[PDB]
Design a protein around this nucleic acid. Structure first.
Ligand SMILES: [Zn+2]
Ligand SMILES: [Zn+2]
Ligand SMILES: [Zn+2]
Ligand SMILES: [Zn+2]
Lengths: 1131, 117, 67
RNA sequence: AUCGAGAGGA
């Protein structure tokens, strides 16, 4: 029955495999989008108010149902056809499906003359579709079906195709809503502040933040204030309580202080009462609120109405926005004050801003919902204006012409295309970085980009606290994978078994709590709240309970049985403070864990047995979760959980550590993400090395996707001979690194050989490189289109001619065909022409606008595709193919942060060799190891020697006590090798033995995208910028290198004044001006007629020539634009 | 000394503020909303414990013994019920510097005795 | 994508051994014994056969450009 | 070609 330790390493990984058979790696994206389409769009459409318009006749126009068909495309003839994602990629279409809404317009004029007209399936917009979602044409297709459609079966999906560009929505971090968080700002007028970003269940407005603060000590005592929304002045809490109908101080403290035996709380609230005694009735308090507001009505009536509306709608919407909710709002605001007092009295800890239990991940669904709310509101507005301008004339109108569908369509398309998350007009208030271009450089880069999280703290911020690896990231975020540049700690990555909750309605839970012995908050007396336990659901205090323990037992039983409580519902019992917080909302990152009985796992051997035959008896992960054996625990419920790292922790020990565990890790290696799960032995490296590899696995070459032959990507690198690593971890089985690997096993020798590998460099074998070692192919796609925008000027693909075309370069166009397009198989060098495009003029009647190769490439045309774009003019894509043979300067890396460029390449006779004539493919310098402490590199090399000599794949899973260095060495000594991986090598040049026995063996190396040929650049009098006549910027522009301020300072320190003048004047922008010797302002010179005159001074004899930079002339002219007179006085 | 609690009027249920009656030279607690008055019984109006000599045993609740994440010990039996097992934990409360002190709670149900060594 | 022709290190021909290697593996050989049957004694050539991923078999799941 | 944004390298 029990899984014994000897079977555990199989059982756990069997369980893990079942998880990845059920979910995958992009499950969060697909589930978010599916919830958005199934629920969020319908909720948004129904939550909009019916637009009642009347001059008389009236019309309501109620939207009642939505229909999202499959993705289709409409040609110029208008025939709807099912559009495949690959066709969208090739034709630069948007993989979107039409959204139709049912509309009901009832005519009501008078005399009960009512009649309803329903417009079924009114086309309301087009919604882009996430690939492999339920509403994707690739849904449920087999691998054969996907290959029939020219799709990769290993492609995870989880992205959109907007204008042929694959866009991926990055999950955005945000502070959780409807939760009270008591912080303390050191530099502020308030000692403690308790904030609550409140938002109603079905979002319709932004988060309304309410603060309840305490004024810092230094009138008599500490005063509690409340910064309500839409009010620009602090308001005493007692005033707010009275404005809600609680005038008696006893009632207010009944709502705030639940234990009247506690004078400390009492004296700390007393200043607030003493400050509010002149106001003692609800109307006066409402008048005070309205007066403190930023729109103080001259008459107290409208002041009181405004205060009523604010306190009913903007104050704590999550508690309830309807009327008669003042009791719930009063209880909740009293809870906020109670929490603030507990913090000020030291009875509760301040809340941690960085705790991921306090955070939420805004995924594709809830982000598209924000867009859709804004866009549907704008659409209903436009419909209101259109219908109003017609009914004002007293006649009917056609809603089909009122609905301008471009709002929703173009809005979603623009937002996903650019990443600016918001309305196109508010292009600066909008937050960019959402919806990035999917990284297709290697399969690991694609997976990681699809599992990418973002902390929008702002890269400019230099506070390290949000960048720090918090304790609560354990199991939810990769500890290693993070960019090492300016976004350290802000851009994160999901751990492998991390699941972001999609969201759920609290209705069944609330109904069960009602049927259960919970007492509502309006029905109780406050005297009961002392000993009772509060119950919050999605931040709303809904009631109280008397035995929280057996309530938690009941709820956990219900969730483990897949009863009314779904698996993703978090249920935290804080014991010391008697809250029970239940969460069903979306964005809660959680992970699966094995539940533990008294001191035993519930995962018995029968579950492993049924999981082994997963493909026959359809016993899956969901059956494991439904059995009550596995549980999803979120960051906030982990605080109440006692984990076992392994079932070995559940053994009874000579001194028991815990003996009351509640859960167990499925495997600790699941704390790593996609790119860190490729590192072998990451627990033997320094952690920065693991981070650098997690970044560098994403630039590694491989086969980024199986269907690369049909993709017209702008840039693509494919390795000739990708190999799976000889030394692998058990997590790559689910990353599909074995099916799409990104490196080669290289016989690497760590040695000092000729000095060409010093300081992070490598010596490669020229003979190996000749045999296809780390050879790659680079595919570059050029796009072009001939626009017939108007009869004024039209472009067209056609072989240009020297007699008709004007802007025709001296490059030869013979490689083009009569259609103007080069043919595949044609070898093209730099500056060559691949598309001959000519544009009609207003060297006559047509000018050359041909597409050249990006300079200095020298490839062969791989293929040419011709089609029609969305509007329907001819559209061409040409993929050119360039074989990249590794060379000096190309960057290579192992899986341990050990990067370096090729210093030199030696032939096989020049490389050092073992007694059996094995030469290293790569030689790396021993000095790269000691400071870096990448012992995982050495253990991987030794394990790889054992694996190659044994005919297996080494197990480098991080935390594995069945694999240590002594075992690997003992294994290697059985194959006739030195147990530590050393060998006697001979000098290739002289054949003499090397005195020091070299450490050599197979290690998995990666070829990175950074090849020297894509970086080398030179300039000598090339093109210049228009504004300031200085060299351009970039290799692509043939630009010059920037001689910056620091270079100026260095050369000033050198004392090299002529070199400094050469760099900053003569090699950048030499220029001449003519200055009036009297006024010092630039004069008018006419060198052809030799007439120089200053219009200002009315002189034409006292002019002087001045040699100045063009940028300085431009500066002085831009100062004269500002009415400044910079007078260059030559005397 | 001990703290002093707030007391409310019997008519308006607002807090009673302190006042002095010169005629009898006696402390009274009177409402500044209604016209109620009361004869005080403590004679103390304000108390500040600067030292903050708070007995944290009063802040503990027996329910904490149900926490699976707290450590348990068999070495400190309960003086009230004789149960062997007991959870222990530190103060973890602000304004307490010498907070390495351990507080124990009996894990027997319905006993919930709390103490300190 | 396809089995290399030569071993990158020594230059021994491994191109003619992939199919035989697979046939030995379905014959219930261990990978080590299979590599021994094909005469790959240096761990470089054993690396070549043992770490190869036949991606061409997946690229042949797509219909060609011309029928 | 310009502007912005994003992704990267040291
Ligand atoms: Zn002049
Ligand atoms: Zn009174
Ligand atoms: Zn006891
Ligand atoms: Zn070889």
């Amino acid at each position: 029955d029990e899984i014994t330790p000897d079977l555990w390493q199989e059982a756990c990984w069997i369980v893990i495999s079942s998880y990845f058979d059920e979910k995958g790696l992009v499950r969060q994206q697909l589930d978010s989008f599916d919830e958005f389409i199934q629920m969020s769009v319908q909720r948004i459409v129904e939550d909009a108010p019916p637009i009642d318009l009347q001059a008389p006749p009236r019309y309501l126009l109620k939207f009642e149902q939505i229909y999202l068909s499959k993705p289709t495309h409409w040609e110029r003839d208008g025939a709807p056809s099912p559009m495949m994602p690959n066709e969208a990629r090739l034709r630069n279409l948007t993989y979107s499906a039409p959204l139709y809404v049912d509309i009901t317009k009832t005519v009501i004029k008078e005399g009960e003359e009512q009649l309803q007209t329903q417009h079924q399936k009114t086309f309301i917009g087009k919604i882009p579709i996430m690939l492999r979602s339920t509403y994707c044409l690739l849904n449920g297709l087999t691998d054969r079906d996907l290959c029939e459609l020219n799709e990769c079966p290993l492609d995870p999906g989880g992205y959109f195709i907007i204008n042929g560009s694959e866009k991926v929505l990055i999950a955005q971090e945000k502070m959780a809503t409807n939760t009270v968080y008591v912080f303390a700002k050191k530099d502020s007028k308030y000692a403690y502040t308790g904030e609550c970003r409140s938002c109603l269940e079905n979002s319709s407005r932004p988060t309304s933040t309410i603060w309840v603060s305490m004024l810092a000590r230094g009138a008599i005592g500490q005063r509690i204030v409340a910064t309500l929304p839409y009010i620009k002045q602090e308001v005493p809490i007692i005033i707010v309580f009275r404005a809600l109908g609680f005038v008696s101080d006893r009632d207010i403290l009944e709502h705030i202080i639940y234990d009247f035996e506690d004078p400390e709380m009492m004296e700390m609230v007393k200043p607030s009462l003493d400050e509010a005694f002149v106001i003692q009735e609800q109307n006066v308090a409402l008048n005070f609120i309205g007066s403190r507001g930023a729109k103080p009505g001259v008459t107290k009536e409208k002041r009181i109405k405004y205060a009523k509306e604010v306190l009913q709608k903007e104050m704590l919407p999550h508690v309830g926005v309807s009327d008669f909710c003042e009791t719930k709002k009063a209880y909740f605001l009293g809870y906020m004050v109670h929490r603030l007092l507990l913090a000020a009295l030291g009875r509760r800890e301040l809340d941690d801003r960085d705790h991921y239990g306090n955070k939420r991940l805004d995924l594709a669904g809830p982000l598209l919902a924000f867009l859709f709310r804004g866009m549907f509101k704008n659409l209903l507005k436009e419909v209101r204006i259109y219908a109003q301008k017609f009914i004002d004339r007293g006649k009917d109108f056609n809603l089909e012409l009122a609905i301008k569908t471009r709002i929703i369509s173009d809005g979603l398309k623009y937002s996903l295309a650019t990443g600016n998350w918001g309305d196109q007009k508010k292009a600066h208030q909008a937050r960019a970085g959402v919806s990035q271009v999917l990284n297709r450089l290697t399969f690991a880069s694609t997976l990681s980009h699809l599992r990418r999280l973002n902390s929008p703290i702002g890269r400019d911020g230099k506070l390290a606290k949000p960048r720090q690896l918090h304790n609560t990231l354990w199991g939810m975020v990769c500890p290693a994978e993070t960019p090492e540049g300016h976004a350290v700690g802000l851009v994160k990555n999901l751990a492998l078994m991390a699941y972001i909750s999609v969201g759920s309605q609290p209705s069944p839970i609330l109904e069960f709590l009602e049927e259960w012995s919970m007492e509502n908050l309006e029905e109780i007396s406050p005297a009961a709240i002392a000993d009772a336990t509060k119950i919050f659901v999605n931040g709303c205090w809904v009631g109280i309970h008397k035995d929280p323990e057996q309530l938690m037992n009941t709820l956990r039983k219900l969730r483990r049985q897949m009863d009314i409580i779904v698996s993703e519902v978090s249920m935290i019992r804080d014991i010391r403070e008697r809250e029970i917080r239940i969460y069903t909302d979306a964005g809660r990152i959680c992970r699966p864990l094995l539940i533990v009985e008294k001191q035993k796992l519930l995962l018995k051997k029968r579950h492993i047995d049924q999981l082994k035959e997963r493909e026959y008896n359809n016993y899956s992960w969901q059956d494991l979760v439904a059995s009550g054996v596995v549980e999803y625990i979120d960051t906030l419920e982990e605080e109440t959980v006692m984990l076992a790292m392994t079932p070995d922790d559940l053994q009874e020990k000579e001194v028991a550590y815990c003996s009351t565990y509640t859960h167990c890790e499925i495997h600790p290696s699941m704390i790593l993400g996609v790119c860190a799960s490729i590192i072998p032995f990451p627990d033997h490296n320094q952690s920065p090395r693991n981070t650098y590899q997690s970044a560098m696995g994403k630039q590694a070459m491989g086969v980024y996707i199986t269907n690369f032959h049909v993709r017209m990507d702008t840039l693509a690198h494919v390795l000739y001979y990708p190999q799976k690593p000889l030394v692998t971890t058990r997590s790559m089985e689910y990353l599909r690194f074995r099916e799409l690997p990104a490196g080669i096993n290289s016989i690497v020798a760590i040695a000092s050989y000729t000095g060409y590998n010093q300081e992070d460099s490598v010596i490669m074998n020229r003979s190996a490189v000749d045999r296809g070692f780390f050879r790659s192919v680079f595919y570059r796609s050029y796009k072009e289109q001939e626009s017939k925008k108007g009869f004024d000027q039209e472009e067209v693909f056609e072989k240009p001619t020297r007699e008709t075309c004007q802007g025709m370069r001296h490059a030869i166009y013979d490689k083009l065909d009569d259609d103007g397009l080069i043919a595949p198989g044609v070898r093209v060098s730099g500056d060559d022409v691949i598309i001959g495009k000519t544009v009609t003029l207003p060297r006559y009647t047509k000018r050359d606008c041909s597409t050249f190769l990006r300079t200095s490439e020298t490839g062969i045309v791989d293929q040419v595709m011709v089609t029609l774009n969305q509007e329907g003019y001819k559209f061409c894509k040409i993929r050119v193919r360039s074989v990249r043979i590794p060379q000096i300067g190309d960057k290579f890396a192992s899986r341990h942060g050990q990067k370096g460029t090729c210093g030199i390449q030696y032939r096989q006779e020049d490389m050092p060799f073992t007694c059996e004539g094995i030469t290293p493919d790569i030689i790396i310098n021993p000095h790269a190891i000691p400071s870096r402490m990448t012992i995982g590199h050495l253990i991987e090399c030794l394990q790889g020697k054992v694996s190659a000599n044994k005919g297996e794949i080494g197990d480098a899973t991080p935390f594995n006590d069945a694999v240590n260095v002594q075992k690997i060495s003992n294994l290697l000594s059985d194959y006739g090798y030195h147990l530590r991986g050393n060998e006697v090598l001979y000098n290739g040049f002289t054949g003499r033995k090397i005195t020091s026995q070299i450490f050599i063996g197979p290690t998995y190396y990666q070829r990175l995208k950074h090849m020297v040929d894509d970086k080398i650049h030179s300039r000598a009098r090339g093109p210049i910028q228009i504004l300031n006549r200085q060299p351009m910027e970039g290799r692509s522009r043939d630009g010059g290198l920037r001689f910056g301020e620091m270079e100026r300072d260095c050369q000033i320190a050198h004392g090299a004044a002529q070199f400094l003048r050469e760099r900053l004047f003569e090699a950048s922008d030499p220029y001449q001006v003519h200055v009036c010797n009297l006024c010092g302002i630039m004069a008018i010179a006419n060198t052809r007629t030799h007439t120089y005159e200053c219009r200002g001074c009315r002189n034409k004899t006292q002019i002087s020539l001045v040699r100045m930079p063009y940028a300085c002339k431009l500066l002085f002219q831009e100062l004269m634009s500002m009415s400044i007179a910079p007078r260059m006085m030559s005397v | 000394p001990g703290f002093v609690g707030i007391r409310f009027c019997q008519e308006c249920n607002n807090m009673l503020y302190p006042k002095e009656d010169k005629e009898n030279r006696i402390l009274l607690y009177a409402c500044r909303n209604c016209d109620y008055q009361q004869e005080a019984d403590n004679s103390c109006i304000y108390v500040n414990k600067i030292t903050h000599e708070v007995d944290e045993l009063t802040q503990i609740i027996a329910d904490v013994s149900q926490d699976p994440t707290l450590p348990r010990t068999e070495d400190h039996p309960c003086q009230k019920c004789g149960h062997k097992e007991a959870v222990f934990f530190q103060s973890h409360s602000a304004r307490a510097e010498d907070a390495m002190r351990l507080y124990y709670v009996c894990t027997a149900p319905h006993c919930g005795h709390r103490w300190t060594e | 994508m396809i089995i290399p022709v030569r071993c990158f290190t020594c230059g021994k021909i491994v191109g003619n051994k992939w199919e035989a290697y697979l046939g030995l593996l379905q014959a219930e050989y261990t990978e080590g014994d299979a590599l021994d049957a094909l005469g790959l004694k240096r761990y470089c050539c054993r690396r070549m056969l043992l770490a190869h991923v036949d991606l061409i078999e997946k690229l042949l799941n797509y219909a060609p450009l011309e029928k």
